[model samples]
Target: NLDIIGKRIEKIKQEHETSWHYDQDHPYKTWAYHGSYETKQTASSMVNGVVRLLTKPWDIIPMVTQMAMTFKEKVDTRTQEPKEGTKKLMKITAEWLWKELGKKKTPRMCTREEFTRKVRSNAALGAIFNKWKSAREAVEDSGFWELVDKERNLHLEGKCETCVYNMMSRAIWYMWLGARFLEFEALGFLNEDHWFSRENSLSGVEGEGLHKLGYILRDVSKKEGGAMYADDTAGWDTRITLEDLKNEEMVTNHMEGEHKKLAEAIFKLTYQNKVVRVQRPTTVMDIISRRDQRGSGQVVTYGLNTFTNMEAQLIRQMEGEGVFKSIQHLTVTEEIAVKNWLVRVGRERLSRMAISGDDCVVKPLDDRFASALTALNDMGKVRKDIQQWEPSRGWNDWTQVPFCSHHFHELIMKDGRVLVVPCRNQDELIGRARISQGAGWSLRETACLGKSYAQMWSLMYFHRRDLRLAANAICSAVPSHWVPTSRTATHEWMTTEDMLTVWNRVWIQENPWMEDKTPVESWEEIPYLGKREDQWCGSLIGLTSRATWAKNIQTAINQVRSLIGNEEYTDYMPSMKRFRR
Candidate 1:
């Protein structure tokens, strides 16, 4: 049956292609590719691709196949060797297909007013049509009616330029609706009583209201930096029961603020003085959890069909014992991978810093001259106070010294200690590196890099030692005002806070690190860690605390309540509470 269906579809596809290509001057082709006005390339692409797929007559084959299989299953369940039932089913299926495909239609022109009214009557289309209503007036002003009259004349004479195009377009749209209707029927989503069903008297208005409410709650909850699972709709009283109306009224009465306004709007639009039954929409998580309970193996699977008896026994035992043990194993693996990756990145950054420091003294002549001047001053041959000294050739001779050539500053302390500070540019670069060691290159990587706040905190915690090392490196290179105050102070004695203060004083003047320091973007040229090489780092933070997960869920529930104009639900809602033994 599948083979025959495939062959028939292929034949029809070939016939359509042959007709489409042979008629090179087809109206659709002209309009799509070489129109005098604005081209309909966008429209044509859908016509040739998705629309064609949905509109194809072969779509009925799947429906027929499903029907035949269901009939066979029903028959087999009644009795074994149901040959008679199978024969009858096949004949009925063939006759139905023949009747469906053999039907023909007389194409008729639909007026612009009729089309506009139909679009306005449908909720989704109405919203879209309203947006482009002004644009349509512009099109009409540009001789749209003239073109329509010309097409009508051609259509009347059976030339079928615009008639065929219009018929095919309408057919494509209706076929898409037909396909979606079949899917909704199969999923039991088309119950006329359900609030989400468009066929319902409410026409899914209540569903839209609930969705908008959910969105507002989600956004407000996110502002508080809480984790919100899309599946957490635990206490929402949206179910239809014997006392459903009373419960719904109670919910509405409890609603306050924006929630109350929305509830009133919903009542006015959908349920005022109307007897209706509505069911709460099942969340994706609910579906999966229910399927798991039913032993459907949709959410949790062993990945392979074949297993030894011992392995199967072990699997059942493990599942019965609970999957949290496996979760723990996975979490440990993630922590190890992330920790190693952090250490590796830290070591590489340190190496890069060392290389940069080595490259700072690149001019050999400048280094030699600077060393000679320091030696002469040390031997008392030259004045210790360099402000009163001069070279025999000219002061320009001192330009060869690295300290004189570069923007280095020589600071003499009141205690007679001379300190040489590197140029501001070099100091800023080192300071940026020092700060980046704490901030890390994760944010600089790309927007695709996904990490939660907890995960980020965990990463920084692991990198604390490396950050201190970086701070020490910066302290060794830059002079600090705080160090002179302590008689025995060295770079090794500098704390992280001391290093930041020195960095702020030297590089950032007005906007100090203590006030408002800007983040540096210095890792654009750095290569990122590959996803394949670091798969285990995905859930490092999730494994640490179940209480944290519970808190997030509770916070989300509280947000939902707050949006619904009810008091916050603050009880501890444990994560996977039902799954606990």
Candidate 2:
């Protein structure tokens, strides 16, 4: 039954693909002419070019082979004897060659490239190409496996692909893949006989935003030498399994002797301690507080132990949270007194963003939400201008203003469809509007695109007139409302100047986000896109008391940038603004 289901899914994809129907009903069609046709053409060319050329592992020839050749070139050149440092480079090159190719191939490291060329066409080498005898010798050589294990453990510490290691380190993954294939099948979720069922395959490397496993461990001394790191981390809860493996008893009961110790060590090594250790004061009295003990390490040890008790109490109170679910030794690595103040501040911010105390979660407004909140009730002139018609050009000549800007008309109205602001009366309703406008850091002519908080405040600094226009637009957009015993005034924000003042402060003067700007000075002291006038703000606007915490908060952002690494931001520096002054 499962086999039938899997086969049916595969057949559906194949049929959908093969029936091009004169290319009329193509699924890959894009907005341009022949877009799908040319895309498929280039894609097939790439697959045939790269996929058809793969060969045996050792036969594949790594960069080390070229490195060896480069060293050989140096030896051939330089008629006089090369220096000791040059000789060391040759030795390092040879050792790497021998380490990978072994003693059998060691004597004639020169022959490796020669041998691989013949093997690659029908490739497979080492144990993979039936060189298991030397493979066994190298791995079983006692301390060698330990070295490989250490290297593997170190690589696996960061994100998995960042780990730098090679070969049978991958055998664990091959086995793990099969095991999960079976486990999911029994659970009736897999519904496939073969592993490559299209329904559950080919979307490899898709969902890796969360943690995934790349683990391998085996008793090579036994009849079977195996690995645990697998080809797919598809369904494995690696982080969860790792947390469970921390228990000493689980380690002891699951394995005997050394394996038990090995598992415990891995669990101990990788566990992330949640506590952020603060720098301790050092003084004459501080020394006396810990008579025989070494400095801060002892204090940190005590703090960790005390934290474990607090964590246990908190876990009981907040039982459902998973960040706390994997609790153990709650350690906090300390730092020197003054440095990394940025991270200390960041840890506070991240904790705040993750949990909310208010009735609604705060979200920055987007296009759809902004449009939904807009009202047309009192805005007749604006609606009339938008809904007023324009003639359509012929289709071949590109006919519409975004399909005749009909979408704009859809957005305007009077009552804009009724006073649904159910706050007890008009004061509360208008107050919320004032709060939202200021809290949002209202930028000119609010649009579907994101306008930075920096730009809005920059406007306040350099162009108060434009900022006022934007502020008035925000005030005017408030929906019409009926109130009892109101003043004879028909105008709003006309007599109410304080509300505008409050709105301006929310965007400018009272910004809570800036800190630690002395290290660098703006515009260079600052790290983001510059001020409105010059893509650069003023040097010392200790002037015109305005809230500008958004830009200040950006400097502290170096903490997150450092943690995630700046790979994605390499080209984004000019626009992004990092290194706070």
Candidate 3:
């Protein structure tokens, strides 16, 4: 069911992350195109905005697995070196396009005139656009953006055969092709594709806005592993160089057990702690204070002791509510922190925190609840209260602060529409499920679904792993499916002022159905298009995520880009934004 998503995850990581970092001698340069953000909070918010413009995972791609299949067959597996297929193909595609524009000789345009220059220029991009243009111009009347009541899909197969990845890479390609076809000055933007890869992997690697931290574990003996340094994280580091790895291999082996212990420590702190560590410093310390106390009121170990009480309560609640469900350890996450922030602050806070603060709570955001909240809203089929469920004796973080995934949305709206928010930092997490319903089908009646937070994060990862599902995922996640989905989707953010008029016109005019519904009476909010201007900084730095706390308290990345400036926008900093084209 999720084959496509999984494959695309592998494809994306291989295509970008495997070589995500540049060689010491050949570093990928940063550029202006890379937008800014004040901190990880701004970055995360920005990313989430992009996610909003795009469809939910289920709606468009349904499952990341399906999108993965499309990517494998059309973008990756179809090629010899599927891993670097697009990177290689983008170059090839450029040359193919340069030649096709009647040899316009756009100076170093695809630079491969030796080959057939006239044949490769986005033939796929040209056909549908041309056909649509010709058909569009002919209208010459009332219906400018509308065509006959026909199901319109850009090129999906054959000459115009485009898979999800192409769509992911298409924003630049499409824009370029459009420019080329019309001989416009904006033709240069087409080349943006070539530079979209790892070249700009980071927005501010030069330390302009963010720092790049690549992690790799070190050597240690088991007994002397994390247990030894459990309380001394001040000197522990994963910043070994390649040469260091080679030279230390011998010593590393001696510390193999220790290295594994360190890894376990990292994972526990990275994952488990976030899930069950129990939010609220007071609560955590309270449990710790009771450490040596005998029975009844003593501090419990993290394994099973900390959560036994909590789980029993959850069990009681479940029995009381009579909601039979598969209780995974993920539900009992530091989501309490996340929810508190979302309700009090917002996801933007988390993103900014990651980019600006060293103590950001990104790991908590990666846990089960983040994903589950979205999933339950979109997938569950019965009356449910998907509460945080922890182990019988370990981690008490979630017990103090908890959130029931979008079960509220289902309860309030009474409409089972799914809302899949891909919250993970990993692009390969989105499930690869077949999203293309058929030759002629509308999302209104039969659409893809992803309600769980996990499913959303999975899809987000899936899109990065393979750019193809961006459109479909967006289409499915939202209440409306007409909006176009781009892997690295973006919008010309409008100010809160003009946005009201602009959105009302766009929504009412495009939707028409809103005419019968309640009127918003103001232009403060746009239905689909979004507006983001406020932040902790003066730049383009925007939050791209919402985080939960780990070990203790909520992890909403409290501190964001606190930079002070007017002319230089913090939002445009390198580490805060995610871009594909």
Candidate 4:
């Protein structure tokens, strides 16, 4: 089954070579949840290239960060409490995007009314950008990295703080938007059909929303239904339930025949797989649940999965009775491995409790010893509480225990100090990228990075005027494609606050482009921003490679200049391509 599953996906890889490539040099470092020697080389090259582009504007960061900070302080002071007015206005914006912007095109240069609306409401876009910029800077300027932990001990796992190392850096996302806008400008107008165009349908990432666009293009040539008029109902559709899978007739009608088969396959794999349960590590949270109550540092035990349970189930059996006594010498192991962290720690917990004898080891703790340990745990909470610990609080003097400080447990030393141990939740155990890259339905309830829907109204406000202006200035000055065909179109109403409201996230189409000036009575027009497929870092690599490969390199070079003003991106182009399969 594993081999069959692997080969099935490998076939997809071959079919989508343009979009998905297997990095033979570092096969594991692929979009496929799949390896290394060229891995470091590819990774370093991308980073180095990005650093080169970013540093050209390095001197301006302080200034940009300051401007964003000023604007952010004002924006942050505003309330986030949900408002009906904001929701209604979002409907208006969504209509414009879906009905107008989604429809318009040029000699690939025709101005879409949606772009016009965006330019008119540019203030709100700029404001939102400033807010995020300020947030990013504030996180850095205040020494936040030093104050907060890495959530999980990501450092031990050879990972840098969360998304920083893995992610292409948020700056890339910002610059890429400018790149898209510039591409449209160079083409004369919004080339909605261009691959990189804001609403381009040709290379719309795979899955549900694009099917209609796919069909439309295939029917003619397809993202399926036009973004301007795609049926986004699937975004709000309920999660697929077991019963839905059982109803084969229902599935057959709702999806294509092939898709029905895939759905059924997923159903059987997820629900029909064998059950496998094993021992896992326990945390302070679990122990707390076992304690009936905390009254004057005394905990009344009335829970099943207690320290007592640990003793009766496995510990006493392994150590031959009374092993729970003198758990004083026991210490929780260091940060565990990803594969066996849970099982190993649970096992070593017993090893730490062993009583060393003159010849070998002594008998384990007795039931009375478990009671003593419980009392020790009571003080452990007070002294080693995660919320309370600090440099001044004397972490150095505290004895290292299996438990923590905050989301951790406490340890007491024979001499007298207390130490804290951190615990991992499931999310913390697995990084976001891994979760995001995970694929397919499983036989068991497991984490899988599957397709997700875009939030309603598809709003991301940014005042990246600096980047936008740079791209605009560069592209326009080059003496090419800015369209005047549809400049007359503009928004009826606009506000920075309403535009920035996060909930105004969904949009609907009254009329798709070039079809009719007004909406139809039946409301047959569809909605958008539709369901988006999950992407891997490899996707970004693929995009960059495609952008710089041939004639596309012309735009790539142009965007780099627009971003950094006058950086030499030529040297880095090859390096960027190093990530290509």
Question: Cα-based RMSD of the predictions, in order?
Answer: 34.7, 33.6, 28.3, 29.9
Q: Give me the displacement of residue 462 in model 1, in angstroms.
A: 40
TM-score of each: 0.16, 0.14, 0.16, 0.18
Global CA lDDT computed for model 1: 0.22
Q: For residues 280-355, what per-residue lDDT tens digits would candidate 3 score against the true structure?
A: 2111100010011011101011111111211222222222232323323223232333233233523222221111
| Candidate 3 to truth, TM | 0.16
For TM-score, candidate 2 versus 4, the one ahead is 4
> Where does candidate 2 have its weakest 10-residue lDDT segment?
210-219
Off by over 4 Å in 2: 1-251, 254-258, 264-311, 314-581
Off by over 4 Å in 3: 1-503, 521-558, 564-581
lDDT of 2 by residue, 360-478 (tens): 01111111211211111111101112222221111111111111011001111121221000001112211222211212322221211111211222222212222222232222222
Error of 1 at 313 (Å): 42
Candidate with best TM-score: 4
As a whole number from 0 to 100, the lDDT of residue 234 in candidate 2 is 16
Sorted on TM-score, highest at the top, how do the candidates line up? 4, 3, 1, 2
